[PDB]
Amino acid sequence: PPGPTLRELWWVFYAADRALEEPRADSGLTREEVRAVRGFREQAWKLFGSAGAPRAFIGAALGLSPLQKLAVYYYIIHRERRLSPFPALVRLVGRYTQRHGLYVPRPDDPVLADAINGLFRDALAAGTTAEQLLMFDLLPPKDVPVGSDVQADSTALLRFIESQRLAVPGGVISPEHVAYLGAFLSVLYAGRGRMSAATHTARLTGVTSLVLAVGDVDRLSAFDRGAAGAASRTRAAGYLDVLLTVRLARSQ
Ligand SMILES: [Cl-]
Ligand SMILES: [Cl-]
Ligand SMILES: [Cl-]
Ligand SMILES: [Cl-]
Ligand SMILES: [Cl-]
Ligand SMILES: [Cl-]
């Protein structure tokens, strides 16, 4: 069974930051597990930055720490095998639990299911936008700007959607698709929300259906049942995995 589980995500989501703010946090676990928490914190900064230096990336309007975003990020991907850093994180939370007690989320803490659904809808909005764009192989002419990180993200998403055969087999990824999806992502990577990104992209492209498509995303949840709920969980896992591979390659 691929990890991480909802229980594992819960312990890390609500107490990993509070556990790291304790002096003897690593005194409970081993060296190989320190090295696992090491890379997890490294990638959290490489993807989302700091609480004071936040990078522009997906899940920007969720009000989550970089560790909380990354934990939700891996749970949606749901491909942690035997080399997962989560048991090291759980044992870190366990040691904090032995010292300062069990931490219960306060009434103004992030809601876990909303944190999952927010990142899950962000991933579906980007993919469903790239899907709507590829349905038109001719759009108002634009060129991809010179130095935009959203170019690498947008290109990888469009190429991945061709591999999924969600777009009609035969179409071409034109520079208009790369540029207009990058405009959606640049807005989405702010705190503007999916609707503000869909409407702004629909203004530029003229794709009228682009707004209602993102609206149907908001009618979905990462906990839906049946083949439909699993099909959306697969899309969100793929899109987030596509953006993850790019962001980790450009950071090296
Ligand atoms: Cl689970
Ligand atoms: Cl931080
Ligand atoms: Cl949301
Ligand atoms: Cl067309
Ligand atoms: Cl292929
Ligand atoms: Cl913007």
Side-chain angles (χ1 to χ4, degrees):
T5 67
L6 263 181
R7 168 176 286 266
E8 289 172 313
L9 168 60
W10 192 96
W11 292 113
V12 181
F13 180 85
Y14 284 113
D17 289 311
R18 242 180 175 91
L20 291 181
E21 298 171 359
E22 292 302 335
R24 322 220 204 103
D26 303 337
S27 294
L29 49 95
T30 64
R31 283 181 168 178
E32 186 177 357
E33 290 176 317
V34 166
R35 188 162 58 258
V37 180
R38 175 195 77 176
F40 187 85
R41 298 183 66 187
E42 292 178 357
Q43 297 167 14
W45 173 86
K46 282 153 53 182
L47 296 183
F48 309 105
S50 311
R55 301 197 175 190
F57 194 41
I58 203 170
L62 295 179
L64 304 174
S65 64
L67 289 192
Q68 286 178 334
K69 294 184 180 183
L70 189 58
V72 178
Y73 207 104
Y74 282 177
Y75 168 79
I76 295 181
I77 293 185
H78 198 249
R79 298 170 199 183
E80 298 292 316
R81 293 297 182 178
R82 306 177 308 277
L83 284 74
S84 168
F86 269 80
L89 295 179
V90 173
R91 295 189 178 268
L92 185 94
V93 178
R95 296 302 160 178
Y96 171 81
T97 307
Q98 298 184 216
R99 301 193 185 105
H100 295 63
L102 170 63
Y103 176 78
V104 179
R106 287 127 65 106
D108 64 338
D109 278 339
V111 180
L112 181 53
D114 296 330
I116 295 178
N117 288 328
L119 195 66
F120 166 89
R121 289 185 183 105
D122 277 345
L124 291 192
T128 201
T129 291
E131 179 183 0
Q132 292 274 346
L133 292 182
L134 292 179
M135 288 293 98
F136 303 96
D137 295 350
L138 258 77
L139 289 173
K142 285 301 180 303
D143 282 337
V144 197
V146 182
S148 64
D149 278 335
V150 298
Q151 168 180 39
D153 288 341
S154 165
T155 300
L157 281 181
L158 295 157
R159 281 202 273 244
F160 179 72
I161 288 189
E162 294 291 345
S163 290
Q164 290 182 315
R165 274 70 193 184
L166 275 178
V168 180
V172 157
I173 303 178
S174 72
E176 278 77 38
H177 298 107
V178 175
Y180 281 138
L181 174 61
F184 180 90
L185 297 182
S186 62
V187 183
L188 183 71
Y189 291 169
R192 313 272 179 79
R194 296 174 295 274
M195 296 306 302
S196 185
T199 54
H200 178 256
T201 311
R203 279 203 222 97
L204 299 170
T205 68
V207 179
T208 53
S209 56
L210 189 60
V211 169
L212 182 62
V214 180
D216 295 352
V217 168
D218 289 281
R219 284 175 169 176
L220 298 175
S221 165
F223 309 96
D224 298 340
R225 189 44 204 152
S232 61
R233 286 189 294 271
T234 296
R235 285 180 173 86
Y239 303 151
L240 286 187
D241 208 336
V242 165
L243 302 180
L244 173 64
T245 314
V246 173
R247 293 291 193 180
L248 293 188
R250 310 197 94 200
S251 65
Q252 290 192 12

